[PDB]
Design a protein. Sequence first.
Lengths: 263, 257
Amino acid sequence: KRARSANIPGAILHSLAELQDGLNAMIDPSWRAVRSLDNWALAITMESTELLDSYPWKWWKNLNATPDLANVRIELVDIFHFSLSGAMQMRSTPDDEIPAASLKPLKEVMTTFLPAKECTSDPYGFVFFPLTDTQNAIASFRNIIQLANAYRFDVIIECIIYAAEDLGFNLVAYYIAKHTLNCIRQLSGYKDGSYVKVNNGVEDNSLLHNCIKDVSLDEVLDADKYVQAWNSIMANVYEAFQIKESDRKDAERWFALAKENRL
Amino acid sequence: NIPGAILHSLAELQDGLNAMIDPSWRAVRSLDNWALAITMESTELLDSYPWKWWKNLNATPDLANVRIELVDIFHFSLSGAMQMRSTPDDEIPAASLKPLKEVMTTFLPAKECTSDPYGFVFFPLTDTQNAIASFRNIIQLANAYRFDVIIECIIYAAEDLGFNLVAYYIAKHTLNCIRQLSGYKDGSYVKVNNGVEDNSLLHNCIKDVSLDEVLDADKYVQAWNSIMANVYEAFQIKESDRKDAERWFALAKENRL
Ligand SMILES: O=c1ccn([C@H]2C[C@H](O)[C@@H](COP(=O)(O)O)O2)c(=O)[nH]1
Ligand SMILES: O=c1ccn([C@H]2C[C@H](O)[C@@H](COP(=O)(O)O)O2)c(=O)[nH]1
Ligand SMILES: [Mg+2]
């Protein structure tokens, strides 16, 4: 009876991509025509440094500070949205519109940073473990930025998956939770500026950690249990933000909206 | 454009500020430290711009904050250039020696524009996409340890944005000392509280300051001092806690023995 590792099966990645398409479409219905590949690379760039800022990297300020690993988890998930969006758009881009950099050998467009102390890494050698270590984090995310510059969105997804497994959290479960917060934000005036993220005292991101305490690694990838497992996660997030039933969506509605779109 | 001998003197103030943080900074810091700092400041710069297509869609570029970030990147690139000069040759990262074409992919904005002489920074920098392509190029320059190229780009950036880079440097330099004095290292001092950020009080300290005052390779020492004093005054810093430009020069010359 074999154990399901932390790799995301193809079938599940498809479903993840359908959710992502739905969220992107809430933002702009023609998101593929409107967004550029550079947008997603930029967004990954910004989230990467925002992640690094969770570590005490600064030698001139706040010594005796420890990494804010709760925030690292959310930032990884944010990067995952943007890379998944980027990988999808890559597949949707015409060939004459393909940036030359995406096709040149990686070694030509990138320098791989390595930490000074011995460590293990992901299979590509871009991300370094343990990620509780600031120097490992720094080298990893300087590599992610350069991957984003060479449009390697699929390599990035792979790296995030190993990153989540090092840090010991359920990436897919967090994805579902953050996806749901993202949808909530779009329903509640994120664009026009009326939304309150740091409401009552806590950042809205911080409420998600409790919404996924129940879910298991297998439970969220098992072809039998996953739709239900994803749905309870969505429900937990919706309920936490006091979102009415009529405004909610379930995983199957997202699959239906995506399929309806491919026509 | 900053005469060579002025740049040489800014380097000495940077040296002095660096030694306040760690006495033997050149041995303690690494090339990667500076390249990372610039990377982190580069994205803080971009986040002054309304780059998010999903949130805050009529936000205004915060150009006042862009001036401050440009100046921080300047502190960090001066430090890197210095770090390079005192790094032994056999420890010089190989990427620094390659032609620029080999170590970067130059991001261009979609709409036509002018640029700096290298074609890395794009004008006007009031424009979000021009800013974005500029600082995604700066990050790549940082990765290749090209601190001197970065310094040149920042100078051209300041010129396009119409503010006085050297005056801003002296002001932020003064604030950095103030921070170290007030115990920034251990948390006794915070840079932002109740919607008041210390950098934001710098602008009124140097509003009046001419390009010619601060660059005149004859009468610039006095101009820098008056900036230093205005900033110290703006933060209510006692006289005995202040330092002047000649103190930092002397500090640096005495450290070079
Ligand atoms: O087209 C978009 C734009 C944004 N996001 C999501 C991805 C991240 O999880 C989240 C980050 O937004 P902030 O929390 O930083 O505002 O937004 C998308 O999924 N698609
Ligand atoms: O070795 C150092 C460390 C920090 N700084 C300065 C550069 C920036 O102007 C300023 C940024 O500090 P924060 O605003 O990030 O705290 O600190 C230096 O000059 N040298
Ligand atoms: Mg700054």
